[PDB]
Amino acid sequence: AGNQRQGVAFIRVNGMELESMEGASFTPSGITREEVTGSRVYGWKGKPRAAKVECKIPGGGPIGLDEIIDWENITVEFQADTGETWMLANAWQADEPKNDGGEISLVLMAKQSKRIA
Amino acid sequence: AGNQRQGVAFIRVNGMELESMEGASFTPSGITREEVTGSRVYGWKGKPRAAKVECKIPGGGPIGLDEIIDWENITVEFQADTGETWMLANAWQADEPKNDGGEISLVLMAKQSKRIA
Amino acid sequence: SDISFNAIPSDVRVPLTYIEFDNSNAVSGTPAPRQRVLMFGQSGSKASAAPNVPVRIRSGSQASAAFGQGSMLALMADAFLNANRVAELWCIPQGNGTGNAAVGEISLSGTAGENGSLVTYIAGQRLAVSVAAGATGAALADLLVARIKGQPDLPVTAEVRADSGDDDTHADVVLSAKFTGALSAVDVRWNYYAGETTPYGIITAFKAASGKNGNPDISASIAGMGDLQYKYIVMPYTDEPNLNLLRTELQERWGPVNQADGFAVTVLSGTYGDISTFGVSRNDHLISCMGIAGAPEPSYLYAATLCAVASQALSIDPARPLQTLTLPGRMPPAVGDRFTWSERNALLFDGISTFNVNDGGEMQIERMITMYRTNKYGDSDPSYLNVNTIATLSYLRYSLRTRITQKFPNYKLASDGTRFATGQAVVTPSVIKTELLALFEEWENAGLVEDFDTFKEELYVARNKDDKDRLDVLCGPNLINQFRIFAAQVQFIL
Amino acid sequence: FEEWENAGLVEDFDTFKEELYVARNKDDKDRLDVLCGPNLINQFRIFAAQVQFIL
Amino acid sequence: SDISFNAIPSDVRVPLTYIEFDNSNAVSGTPAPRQRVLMFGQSGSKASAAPNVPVRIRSGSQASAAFGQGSMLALMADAFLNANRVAELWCIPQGNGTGNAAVGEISLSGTAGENGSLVTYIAGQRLAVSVAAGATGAALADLLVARIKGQPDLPVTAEVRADSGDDDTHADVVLSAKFTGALSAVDVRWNYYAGETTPYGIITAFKAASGKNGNPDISASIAGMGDLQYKYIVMPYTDEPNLNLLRTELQERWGPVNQADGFAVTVLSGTYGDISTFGVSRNDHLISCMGIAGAPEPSYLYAATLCAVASQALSIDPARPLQTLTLPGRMPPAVGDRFTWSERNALLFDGISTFNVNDGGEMQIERMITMYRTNKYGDSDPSYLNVNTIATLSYLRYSLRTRITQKFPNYKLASDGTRFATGQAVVTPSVIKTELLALFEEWENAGLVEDFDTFKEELYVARNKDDKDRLDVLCGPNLINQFRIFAAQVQFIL
Amino acid sequence: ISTFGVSRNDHLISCMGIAGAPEPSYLYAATLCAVASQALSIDPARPLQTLTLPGRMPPAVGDRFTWSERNALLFDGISTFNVNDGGEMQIERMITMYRTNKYGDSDPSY
Amino acid sequence: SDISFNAIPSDVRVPLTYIEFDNSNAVSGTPAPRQRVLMFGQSGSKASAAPNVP
C-alpha cells in the first residue's frame, strides 16, 4: 500500500494455498555475478541460477505427504501480502522431505520464475 | 480432525508402542531431485531414497537395549495423532545406539514405506 | 484382437510357439486418437461393404476385398497406407452416380516395319507388349487387351473390336471404367520415360468419350460419419453440390459448439484457367486444393498421398512449414505441362496450393495454403491462409481444453477480492489468469508463440454477470512466423 | 452456518445473518419457529473463451 | 457482458470448455472512472451510428463498423486504441459540414525508360506500384487507381480520367474524400524514405482543390455529451466558432459549481506564421495545441496519439513532466520542414506546444503547455501555463472532495471555543484545520507539494456569519517544481 | 426420450437417455446409481462432470447424440453422458426431471 | 528497403532462393547517427537531382 511492508507471504501450488510457517524464502532465477581479480580487479563473471521457494507445512493437514513427495510438474505461485507476485511453472519438489515433529520442509524448485501482476 | 494439526507422533515396533520423546522425525522413501546447471538451467535429476524413523527412548524401560541392538527384520509403524499412518516393513536398526544419560536414540530404517490408512 | 489371425484357433492350450506366414502386409491397429482421418471414395461392383458406412482399413488387401479390386476407394487406401502407417484410417464408400461407364477407345492401325516394343500408360500404369517385325495393328490390340485383362488393378475394362472396310490392321480397343463418376475418365500415353518410342509404321491414337458424368451424392454418407473427430478428410469429388455440404459440416464442426476440428484436402486436375477460376470461386478457410495439369495418374491418388504426408507432418509439429516434403510414388507431369514461376505465384495468390519437381523424378510439396482469400466485407485478408495457422489454432484449443479439464475437474467460482482463505476449493479469475500464463509459457517453450509481454498485457479474465456460473476470458496469442523467403543480393567485384 | 461455509457448501454469510428470524409460536407455546435462507454455492460448469490470434 | 461473445449462446448447460477464435483485437471493458475521455470526429456515408450520440468504443473494428470505413472518427479511435488500452474511450460522431468532396487530382505523364517502382504516399499511407520499361503514364494511373480501390482505409476515393489532345501517356487521377470538412484535404508525396526515386521519364504532379470547406456544427453534440466527467477531450476542428463553444463549456465545467474538470487537446497543421497567429489569438487555460508543418499524416491522428499518451502519463502521475515521451506510429515531417530551436522557443513563448524527433525516426513530445499567456489586465502571467499545473489542481480538488465526503459524511457545525465534550458528533474549525493539515502531509509525501510551514501559516478556517451551515476555508499550496533546464559551463584546460 | 422427459415433471427422479445401447438399460442404471451415490456421499456439492462408468460399453459412433441433441435433452430434463477419448463412457451432467413451476413458468430451482 | 533490388518483385510467394548479379558495388544503408557528413559540390548538365536538396 502507501507505507505497507511485507509481513507475510502466501504460497499456492496448483491453486491450493499451502499452510506455510513463518520465514518463507524465495530466490529469483537469474544470473549470479562472481568476482575476478588477478594483478588488479577486472570485473565480474556470470553463472545461471534457478528459482527456489522454501517453507514449512504442519503435519496432518489436508495435503498428504505422499502427494508432496510426488510433485514433478506443478505450478508454484509466491505472493507477498503487499501484492508482489511471482509465478513458477513446471516446478518440482527438491531435496529430502522430512517430517520432524510435525514439520515438513518444502524446497519447491523451478528453472525460471517471472514476476506476474 | 476438522482443524486438528499434528502435535505428537506414535511409533510401534512389532505391535509394541515405543516410549518416544518429543521431536520424532520421519523421512519417506522416494526420489530425491537434484539441480542441473551448465550454461543455463536445464532441469532436475533423480536419486533413490530410503525411509527413516528417528526417536529417543528412556533407559530402563520394558524393552531392553540388547533387544534394540538386535533388530534386523522388524515391522515399524509411524502414526500421527491426527490419523496419518505409514508402514515400514522389513526394517532394521541403523547407526550407533548410545545410552547417553538415560536417552537411547533409534535410527530405525527401511527400504520402502507406504501410507496405509 | 488388434492382430487378425488366420487358421490359428483362439482356444489353444499346448504350450509352444505358433508361427504363420502371410503375404499381405497389414498395419498395426494401435489407436491414434489425434491422427484420425476419413476418406471419401467410390466402390465398384462385387463390393462387400455397405454404402455410407465407415470402416477401419489397415491393409491394402482388406480394402481391395471390401471395396472391390480396382475401385477408387481401394486405390486411395493403398496410396494412403504406402506413405502413412501411424494414423488411423477410416474409409466410407459412396454410391454410383450418374453417367455412362464408357471412357473412350484406343485406336491402333498400320503395320510394324521393325522390331520394337509398344508401351502404353493407362491411368499411370505401364503396359508393355513386344512388337515383332511385320506385326499388324490387330495383333497388337489383342496383346494389349490380354495384358489389360491380366492386370487387375486397372480401374478400366478392355474389349477388342474390329469392323469397317478399312485394312485388317486397324482394330480399336474399347475401355470402360469400373465405376461411374466425374473421375471415371483416365489418361492414355504411349511414351513417358526416355528411350521409349513407337515402332515404325504403327499409328496410335486415343479418342475420349463425349458424355459427362456426375459425382454421387454424399448427404447420407456425410450424415452417417458419426461423432468422432476426423482431423483430416480426403474428398476427391470436386463439384459444387458436394463441397457445399462438406463446407457446411466443417464450419459447423469448426465452431465453438462442436469443437471437433476437421480439415479437407482435395486435388483438382485441369487446365490453368479452370484451376484459377475454381480457386477464385471458393472462399473457404477449411479446404485446401492443389492444382495439377496433365497428370498421368488420377487426381485422387495425389490427394491421398498429399493428405497422408501433410497429416503426418502436422501431427509431428503443427508449426513447421510444408516446404520440401516429397510425395512418394507419384509421377510428375511432363516437362511442358509443369507450371512456370509466374503461374505458381498467381495460383498461390488465387488460393490454389502448388507443388514442385525435385532434381530427380520426385514430386515435392511447395507450399500448402487454404482457399480463404477475401474478408467478410470484401477486402483482402492474410489470416486463415496457411494450413499451419489452422493446425496451430486447433492444437492450442485442444491443449487449453485438456489443461482446464485436468487441473480444475470440478470447482466453485468466487469473485475477485473475496476472502476465502486456505483449504477451500474455490477458483478466482486471478487463478485462471495464472494458469493461462503458465500454459502460455509451455506453448512458447514448445515453439508455437513468440511474444509474452503483449499476451500478458492483453489478457482479461472476468466472471459473467448473468450466468453466474460462466467465466469469460479474452486472450490473444502471437503465432510465430515461418521462414519462407530468403532474398539475397550479390555484389561481385571483377 | 459457519461450519457449513467452512465445509464448502454455502457462500454468503452477511445475507444469511440478516435474513435469519427466530421466534416462538403464540399457539403451541412449546414450538419454536425459525425461517432461514441459505445461499447454496455455485458450480464451475461452463468455461467460455475467445482467442484473438495475430498472424 | 464486459466481453462481447459471438456464436456462443448465453444459455448453455453442458459442462465443458468453450473456445472461440476472433481476428479483431478487442479491449477489455474494465471501467476507468478517472480516465474517461471524449473524442470529436466526422462520420462518412454507410454509417450505423446516430449523430450527436456518444458511444463506447473498445476496438478498431467496432469503430469502423459504426462510423464507416475510412472515416475520421474511426481512424482517430484506432490511433487512440493503438497507444492507450486502459482508459475509457467515448466517441461522438458529427454531421457533414459545408463544402465540396473534391480534394484535388494527381497528374501522371511521360513514359518510363527504365525498370523501377512508383511509390505514392496519400494521407500518410504508402502505395507502391511496379513500373516496367516502356510503361506509359496512363497504365501507371490505372494501376494506382486499382491499388487505391484495394486499400479500404484511405479516406479518399480515386477515379481515372484521360482527355485532351495531349499524348496518350498523360492521365490524371481525381481524388474525392469520404467526408466534407476543413480536414478533408490530404497530402500527396512520391518519396519519403531513403533509396526511393521516381523512374526516369515519368513526370508526376499534384494539383490541390481551390474551394474551401467548413467544419460541421457541434452545438447539438456539445449539448448531448451528458453529465459525466470527461477528463480529456480530442477536438480536431480548429476553427473559431467551434472552439468558442468548447471554451464556454469547459470554463463552465472548470468552475466551482460543476466541478467536472475537463481538458482539450488539439493539433493544428499549417505554416509557422499561421500557427503563431493562432496561438497568439487564443488565450484559454483549458486548451493545449501542438503545431506541426508539412505533416505527411492528417492532424487528427497526431491529436489522438498525443492525447492518449498525455492522458496515460498524467493519470499515472499528475506532476511528472512530459519531456521525452514518444508518439508510436506517427511519421515525423521532412528534415527541411522541422522547426529550428528559435522557432520552437518562439512557439513556446506564443502558447503553442512543440515536439521533437528522436535520434531514429521516432517523434517525441518536447513540452506541453496551455494557450494561457495574458493576465486579466493584459500583463504576462506564468500561472496556468504547464499542463502539469492543471492536472495537479484537478487531482488536489478531487482528493480534497473525497477526503471531506468520506471522513465527515454528515456532521453538525459548532463555533470554536464551545464546550461540546466527548461523544457528540460535532465539527469545529480546528477539526477541519487538522484534517486539512493531514491531507497536506499525504499530498507532500505523494510528491505534489513542497513547503509545509508556509502552508500551515497561510491556512485559515472559519464559519460563515450568514449561511450558518457553510464553512469557509482559504488555503494556499506550493506546487512542486519540475526539472526542465540543465545549464552547464565547461572550462577545458588544453 | 424427449417426450418422456417433457411428460415427467418430478424433482426427485433423474433419468439418463441412451439410444442403441448394446447392454440392457438396468445395468447402466445400476452403474450410474453406484457412481453417483459414492460421489455424492464423499461430497454433496462437487459436480458430476467427468466421472466414468466402469465396464459399460458405449453405443456405436452413429448412435451417439450430437451436441444439439444433448443440449436439447438437458433442456428437456433428461440427463446426458459422454464417451471418453478411449472406449470409456463418462457422466456428462446429472439433472432432475423438474422443469416447470407450479403456475406453469420455468424454474431453475431443484 | 535498405537494399535496393532490381527486377525482383516485392510481392513474391514462391518459396525458393532469388539471386541477382549487379556490377555496381553499393554500400549498406545502415544508419550511422554519429557519423553523418555533408558534402558540397557542383552538378553539370544532364543532372536528375534538384539543386539545393540533400
Short mmCIF file of C-alpha atoms in Angstrom, two decimals, chain C residues 16-294:
data_model
loop_
_atom_site.label_atom_id
_atom_site.label_comp_id
_atom_site.label_asym_id
_atom_site.label_seq_id
_atom_site.Cartn_x
_atom_site.Cartn_y
_atom_site.Cartn_z
CA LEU C 16 4.60 -73.94 -27.75
CA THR C 17 5.29 -71.27 -30.39
CA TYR C 18 2.86 -70.69 -33.27
CA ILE C 19 4.31 -69.06 -36.40
CA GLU C 20 2.33 -68.18 -39.53
CA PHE C 21 3.29 -66.68 -42.88
CA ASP C 22 1.02 -64.24 -44.72
CA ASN C 23 1.89 -62.30 -47.86
CA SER C 24 -0.29 -59.25 -47.13
CA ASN C 25 1.49 -56.51 -45.17
CA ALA C 26 -1.03 -55.42 -42.56
CA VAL C 27 -0.65 -52.32 -40.37
CA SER C 28 -0.75 -52.41 -36.58
CA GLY C 29 -4.12 -51.36 -35.19
CA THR C 30 -2.70 -49.13 -32.48
CA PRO C 31 -5.25 -46.41 -31.63
CA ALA C 32 -4.24 -42.90 -32.69
CA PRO C 33 -6.92 -40.56 -31.30
CA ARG C 34 -5.05 -37.46 -32.50
CA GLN C 35 -4.50 -38.78 -36.06
CA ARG C 36 -7.96 -39.95 -37.13
CA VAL C 37 -8.62 -39.30 -40.83
CA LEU C 38 -11.55 -40.01 -43.13
CA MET C 39 -11.58 -40.72 -46.86
CA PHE C 40 -14.40 -40.47 -49.40
CA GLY C 41 -14.40 -42.74 -52.43
CA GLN C 42 -16.47 -44.80 -54.83
CA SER C 43 -16.82 -48.58 -54.77
CA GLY C 44 -17.37 -50.70 -57.87
CA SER C 45 -19.29 -53.91 -58.37
CA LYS C 46 -18.59 -57.10 -56.39
CA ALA C 47 -18.24 -54.98 -53.23
CA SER C 48 -18.84 -56.47 -49.79
CA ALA C 49 -19.09 -53.21 -47.81
CA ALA C 50 -22.39 -51.47 -47.14
CA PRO C 51 -22.55 -47.95 -48.63
CA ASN C 52 -22.45 -44.88 -46.38
CA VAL C 53 -20.85 -46.83 -43.52
CA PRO C 54 -17.33 -46.06 -42.24
CA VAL C 55 -14.94 -48.99 -41.87
CA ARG C 56 -11.43 -49.13 -40.41
CA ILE C 57 -8.87 -50.11 -43.06
CA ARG C 58 -5.44 -51.39 -42.04
CA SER C 59 -4.17 -53.10 -45.21
CA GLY C 60 -4.40 -52.76 -48.97
CA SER C 61 -5.69 -56.31 -49.42
CA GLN C 62 -8.51 -55.71 -46.93
CA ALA C 63 -9.53 -52.53 -48.76
CA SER C 64 -9.45 -54.32 -52.12
CA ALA C 65 -11.59 -57.16 -50.76
CA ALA C 66 -14.09 -54.80 -49.11
CA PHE C 67 -14.50 -52.28 -51.95
CA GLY C 68 -13.66 -54.49 -54.93
CA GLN C 69 -10.42 -54.63 -56.89
CA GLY C 70 -9.64 -51.54 -58.94
CA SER C 71 -12.15 -49.30 -57.16
CA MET C 72 -11.35 -45.68 -56.37
CA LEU C 73 -11.51 -46.19 -52.60
CA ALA C 74 -9.23 -49.24 -52.64
CA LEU C 75 -6.56 -47.43 -54.66
CA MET C 76 -6.84 -44.36 -52.41
CA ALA C 77 -6.48 -46.51 -49.29
CA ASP C 78 -3.44 -48.29 -50.73
CA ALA C 79 -1.83 -44.97 -51.63
CA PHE C 80 -2.51 -43.62 -48.13
CA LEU C 81 -1.11 -46.72 -46.43
CA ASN C 82 2.01 -46.76 -48.62
CA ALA C 83 3.06 -43.41 -47.10
CA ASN C 84 1.45 -43.18 -43.62
CA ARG C 85 1.38 -46.21 -41.31
CA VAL C 86 0.80 -44.46 -37.97
CA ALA C 87 -2.54 -42.65 -38.38
CA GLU C 88 -5.97 -44.25 -38.05
CA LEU C 89 -7.56 -44.73 -41.47
CA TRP C 90 -11.34 -44.71 -41.95
CA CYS C 91 -12.93 -45.15 -45.38
CA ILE C 92 -16.61 -44.68 -46.19
CA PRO C 93 -17.84 -45.89 -49.61
CA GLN C 94 -20.17 -43.97 -51.90
CA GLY C 95 -22.85 -44.82 -54.44
CA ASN C 96 -22.63 -45.00 -58.23
CA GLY C 97 -23.54 -41.54 -59.53
CA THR C 98 -24.99 -40.72 -62.94
CA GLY C 99 -23.49 -41.07 -66.40
CA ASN C 100 -22.05 -43.81 -68.59
CA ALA C 101 -19.30 -46.33 -67.92
CA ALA C 102 -17.62 -45.75 -71.29
CA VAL C 103 -14.45 -43.66 -71.06
CA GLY C 104 -13.05 -43.83 -74.60
CA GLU C 105 -11.29 -46.10 -77.05
CA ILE C 106 -7.71 -46.74 -78.17
CA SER C 107 -7.28 -46.94 -81.95
CA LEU C 108 -4.38 -48.94 -83.40
CA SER C 109 -3.59 -49.10 -87.12
CA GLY C 110 -0.71 -49.70 -89.50
CA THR C 111 1.92 -52.42 -89.66
CA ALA C 112 5.27 -52.59 -87.89
CA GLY C 113 8.32 -52.45 -90.15
CA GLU C 114 10.94 -53.11 -87.47
CA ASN C 115 11.43 -54.88 -84.16
CA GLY C 116 10.50 -52.88 -81.07
CA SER C 117 8.18 -52.60 -78.10
CA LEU C 118 4.88 -50.78 -77.56
CA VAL C 119 4.44 -49.18 -74.13
CA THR C 120 1.01 -47.83 -73.18
CA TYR C 121 0.38 -45.90 -69.96
CA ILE C 122 -3.25 -46.25 -68.86
CA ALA C 123 -4.18 -44.46 -65.62
CA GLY C 124 -0.49 -44.14 -64.81
CA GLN C 125 0.21 -47.88 -65.15
CA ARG C 126 2.90 -49.03 -67.57
CA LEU C 127 1.83 -51.74 -70.03
CA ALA C 128 4.47 -53.10 -72.42
CA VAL C 129 3.86 -55.54 -75.28
CA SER C 130 6.58 -56.92 -77.54
CA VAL C 131 6.37 -55.87 -81.19
CA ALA C 132 7.69 -58.16 -83.93
CA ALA C 133 8.63 -57.29 -87.50
CA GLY C 134 5.63 -57.36 -89.82
CA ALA C 135 3.13 -57.37 -86.96
CA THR C 136 -0.23 -55.74 -87.66
CA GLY C 137 -2.29 -53.41 -85.51
CA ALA C 138 -4.93 -56.05 -84.77
CA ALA C 139 -2.41 -58.42 -83.18
CA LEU C 140 -1.01 -55.60 -81.05
CA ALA C 141 -4.55 -54.68 -79.97
CA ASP C 142 -5.21 -58.30 -78.98
CA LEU C 143 -1.98 -58.41 -76.98
CA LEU C 144 -2.88 -55.12 -75.28
CA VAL C 145 -6.34 -56.47 -74.39
CA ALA C 146 -4.76 -59.61 -72.93
CA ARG C 147 -2.28 -57.53 -70.92
CA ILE C 148 -5.05 -55.28 -69.57
CA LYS C 149 -7.11 -58.34 -68.60
CA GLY C 150 -4.02 -59.66 -66.83
CA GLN C 151 -3.64 -56.51 -64.74
CA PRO C 152 -6.33 -56.49 -62.01
CA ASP C 153 -5.53 -53.05 -60.54
CA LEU C 154 -6.51 -51.04 -63.63
CA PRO C 155 -9.85 -49.28 -63.00
CA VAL C 156 -10.80 -50.00 -66.62
CA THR C 157 -12.01 -52.96 -68.67
CA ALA C 158 -10.84 -53.51 -72.24
CA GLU C 159 -12.54 -55.22 -75.17
CA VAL C 160 -11.31 -55.72 -78.74
CA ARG C 161 -13.35 -54.59 -81.74
CA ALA C 162 -12.67 -54.60 -85.48
CA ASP C 163 -15.07 -53.56 -88.25
CA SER C 164 -15.48 -51.32 -91.32
CA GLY C 165 -13.97 -51.72 -94.78
CA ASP C 166 -10.54 -50.43 -93.75
CA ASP C 167 -7.42 -52.58 -93.69
CA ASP C 168 -7.31 -55.62 -91.41
CA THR C 169 -4.50 -53.96 -89.42
CA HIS C 170 -6.85 -51.38 -87.90
CA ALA C 171 -8.51 -52.53 -84.67
CA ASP C 172 -9.57 -50.32 -81.76
CA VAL C 173 -9.85 -51.27 -78.08
CA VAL C 174 -12.88 -50.04 -76.12
CA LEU C 175 -12.29 -49.05 -72.50
CA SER C 176 -14.95 -48.99 -69.78
CA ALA C 177 -14.36 -47.92 -66.19
CA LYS C 178 -15.32 -49.98 -63.14
CA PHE C 179 -17.43 -47.15 -61.70
CA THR C 180 -19.43 -44.14 -62.87
CA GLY C 181 -18.50 -40.59 -61.94
CA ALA C 182 -16.67 -37.44 -62.92
CA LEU C 183 -13.34 -39.18 -62.21
CA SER C 184 -14.05 -42.26 -64.35
CA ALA C 185 -12.14 -40.82 -67.31
CA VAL C 186 -8.47 -41.82 -67.50
CA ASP C 187 -5.36 -40.61 -69.34
CA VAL C 188 -3.58 -42.65 -72.02
CA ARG C 189 0.03 -42.08 -73.07
CA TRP C 190 2.45 -44.05 -75.22
CA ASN C 191 5.81 -42.56 -74.19
CA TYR C 192 6.59 -41.27 -70.69
CA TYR C 193 10.20 -42.23 -69.90
CA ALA C 194 13.26 -41.56 -72.05
CA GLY C 195 14.47 -44.10 -74.58
CA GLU C 196 10.95 -45.28 -75.43
CA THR C 197 9.39 -44.88 -78.87
CA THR C 198 6.61 -46.29 -81.01
CA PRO C 199 7.78 -48.90 -83.56
CA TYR C 200 7.97 -47.55 -87.09
CA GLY C 201 4.84 -47.90 -89.20
CA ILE C 202 2.46 -48.14 -86.22
CA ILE C 203 -0.16 -45.40 -85.80
CA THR C 204 -1.68 -44.96 -82.34
CA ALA C 205 -4.49 -42.62 -81.30
CA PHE C 206 -6.90 -42.15 -78.41
CA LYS C 207 -10.44 -40.76 -78.63
CA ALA C 208 -12.08 -39.74 -75.36
CA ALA C 209 -15.77 -40.14 -74.61
CA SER C 210 -18.24 -37.34 -75.31
CA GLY C 211 -20.66 -37.72 -72.40
CA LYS C 212 -20.31 -36.19 -68.95
CA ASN C 213 -20.88 -37.95 -65.64
CA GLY C 214 -21.87 -36.69 -62.20
CA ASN C 215 -20.46 -37.41 -58.78
CA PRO C 216 -22.63 -39.44 -56.38
CA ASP C 217 -24.48 -37.70 -53.57
CA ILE C 218 -22.77 -37.63 -50.17
CA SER C 219 -25.69 -36.50 -47.99
CA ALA C 220 -26.25 -39.95 -46.50
CA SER C 221 -22.50 -40.50 -46.13
CA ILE C 222 -21.92 -37.10 -44.52
CA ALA C 223 -24.86 -37.77 -42.20
CA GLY C 224 -23.51 -41.20 -41.22
CA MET C 225 -19.93 -40.19 -40.38
CA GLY C 226 -20.57 -40.26 -36.63
CA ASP C 227 -19.45 -38.03 -33.78
CA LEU C 228 -15.70 -38.73 -33.76
CA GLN C 229 -13.14 -36.02 -34.51
CA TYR C 230 -11.75 -36.62 -38.01
CA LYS C 231 -8.85 -34.18 -38.15
CA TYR C 232 -8.22 -34.64 -41.89
CA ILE C 233 -10.67 -35.50 -44.68
CA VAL C 234 -9.95 -36.65 -48.24
CA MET C 235 -12.55 -35.53 -50.79
CA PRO C 236 -11.88 -36.41 -54.45
CA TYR C 237 -15.24 -35.16 -55.76
CA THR C 238 -14.55 -31.56 -56.83
CA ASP C 239 -18.08 -30.35 -57.53
CA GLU C 240 -20.15 -27.55 -56.04
CA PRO C 241 -23.10 -29.59 -54.65
CA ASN C 242 -20.84 -31.88 -52.60
CA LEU C 243 -18.39 -29.19 -51.49
CA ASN C 244 -21.24 -27.03 -50.16
CA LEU C 245 -22.37 -29.81 -47.81
CA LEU C 246 -18.77 -30.50 -46.79
CA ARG C 247 -18.20 -26.81 -46.05
CA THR C 248 -21.41 -26.61 -44.03
CA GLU C 249 -20.46 -29.64 -41.93
CA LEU C 250 -16.87 -28.47 -41.43
CA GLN C 251 -17.89 -24.94 -40.41
CA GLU C 252 -20.46 -26.41 -38.03
CA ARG C 253 -17.69 -28.53 -36.51
CA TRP C 254 -15.21 -25.63 -36.52
CA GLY C 255 -17.47 -23.53 -34.29
CA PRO C 256 -17.08 -23.27 -30.52
CA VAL C 257 -20.11 -25.54 -30.08
CA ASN C 258 -18.98 -28.84 -31.61
CA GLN C 259 -15.22 -28.25 -31.12
CA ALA C 260 -14.47 -31.25 -33.39
CA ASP C 261 -11.97 -29.62 -35.73
CA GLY C 262 -11.63 -31.01 -39.23
CA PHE C 263 -9.72 -30.27 -42.42
CA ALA C 264 -10.28 -31.35 -46.03
CA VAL C 265 -7.61 -31.93 -48.68
CA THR C 266 -8.57 -32.01 -52.37
CA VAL C 267 -6.72 -32.12 -55.69
CA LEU C 268 -8.17 -30.70 -58.91
CA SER C 269 -6.90 -31.75 -62.35
CA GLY C 270 -7.45 -29.49 -65.33
CA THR C 271 -6.18 -26.53 -67.30
CA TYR C 272 -4.63 -23.48 -65.67
CA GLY C 273 -7.67 -21.29 -66.33
CA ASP C 274 -10.09 -23.80 -64.82
CA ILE C 275 -7.94 -24.17 -61.70
CA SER C 276 -7.69 -20.40 -61.31
CA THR C 277 -11.45 -19.99 -61.74
CA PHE C 278 -12.19 -22.70 -59.16
CA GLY C 279 -9.73 -21.21 -56.66
CA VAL C 280 -11.21 -17.73 -57.07
CA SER C 281 -14.75 -19.11 -56.76
CA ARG C 282 -14.16 -20.94 -53.49
CA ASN C 283 -13.56 -18.82 -50.38
CA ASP C 284 -13.47 -21.32 -47.50
CA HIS C 285 -10.81 -21.42 -44.78
CA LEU C 286 -11.20 -25.16 -44.10
CA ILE C 287 -10.36 -26.66 -47.52
CA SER C 288 -7.02 -26.72 -49.33
CA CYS C 289 -6.76 -27.69 -53.00
CA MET C 290 -3.66 -28.40 -55.09
CA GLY C 291 -3.81 -27.83 -58.84
CA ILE C 292 -2.11 -30.07 -61.39
CA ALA C 293 -2.27 -30.20 -65.19
CA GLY C 294 -1.53 -33.19 -67.41
#
